[PDB]
Amino acid sequence: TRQARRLYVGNIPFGITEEAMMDFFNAQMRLGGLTQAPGNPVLAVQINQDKNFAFLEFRSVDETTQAMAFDGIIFQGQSLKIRRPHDYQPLPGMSENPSVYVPGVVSTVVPDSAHKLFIGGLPNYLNDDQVKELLTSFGPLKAFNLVKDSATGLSKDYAFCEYVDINVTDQAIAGLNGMQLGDKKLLVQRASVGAK
RNA sequence: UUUUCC
């Protein structure tokens, strides 16, 4: 069951320790009401600092599945990218999708879709949390990801998002498209317009 | 200025 008891966590804060990450996830699991017993659901964390990802190992298949609901949670300003291991395949009797919804957690999986938005020209000093806040001002988000350099972790100055209410899409465009900030000017438009 | 092991 081990492949079904581990998760990839990407975009982790620079310099974070394995025990700091374990404490964070154990606390979040209990605060969200996802822990299915006394004691810690997360048994171990293994971090690769050079490449900036971690793998979490859980005591339970079901608690592993519930933890998928934390995808996008902000940790020291960064959107944690929670994913299955690539060699995971659902088991018999187990369900692969989370039973729960953690309030305020915004998924990082933003599928191409009608009202998926592109936001370009962002100031380079804004982190995942601040950019998400910029967009949440117009309405609650269904999904969001700020694109970062895979080696340095620095922002690439563009993001994608999807609002819960499809009608907020045009309000966010009207509020943000063409806004000038120094050298740069925001481009905010449905991502299909400028995609390849 | 179209999301990264054992």
From Swiss-Prot:
GO biological-process terms attached to the record: mRNA processing; mRNA splicing, via spliceosome; negative regulation of mRNA splicing, via spliceosome; negative regulation of protein ubiquitination; positive regulation of RNA splicing; spliceosomal complex assembly
Record's GO cellular component terms: commitment complex; nuclear speck; nucleoplasm; nucleus; spliceosomal complex; U2-type prespliceosome; U2AF complex
Residues recorded with modification 5-hydroxylysine: K132
The protein's role, per its UniProt record: Plays a role in pre-mRNA splicing and 3'-end processing. By recruiting PRPF19 and the PRP19C/Prp19 complex/NTC/Nineteen complex to the RNA polymerase II C-terminal domain (CTD), and thereby pre-mRNA, may couple transcription to splicing. Induces cardiac troponin-T (TNNT2) pre-mRNA exon inclusion in muscle. Regulates the TNNT2 exon 5 inclusion through competition with MBNL1. Binds preferentially to a single-stranded structure within the polypyrimidine tract of TNNT2 intron 4 during spliceosome assembly.
Subunit comment: Interacts with U2AF1L4. Heterodimer with U2AF1. Binds unphosphorylated SF1. Interacts with SCAF11 and SNW1. Interacts with ZRSR2/U2AF1-RS2. Interacts with RBM17. Interacts with PRPF19; the interaction is direct. Interacts with POLR2A (via the C-terminal domain); recruits PRPF19 and the Prp19 complex to the pre-mRNA. Interacts with KHDC4 (Isoform 2). Interacts with ZRSR2. Interacts with the SF3B complex composed of SF3B1, SF3B2, SF3B3, SF3B4, SF3B5, SF3B6 and PHF5A.
Membrane-spanning residues: none
Modified residues (Phosphoserine): S150
Alphabetic keyword roster: Acetylation, Disease variant, Hydroxylation, Intellectual disability, Isopeptide bond, mRNA processing, mRNA splicing, Nucleus, Phosphoprotein, Repeat, Repressor, RNA-binding, Spliceosome, Ubl conjugation
Domain RRM: 5-87, 115-193
Protein location: Nucleus
The protein's name: Splicing factor U2AF 65 kDa subunit
Source species: Homo sapiens
Record-level Gene Ontology MF annotations: C2H2 zinc finger domain binding; enzyme binding; molecular function inhibitor activity; poly-pyrimidine tract binding; pre-mRNA 3'-splice site binding; RNA binding
Sequence similarity: Belongs to the splicing factor SR family.
Domain of life: Eukaryota
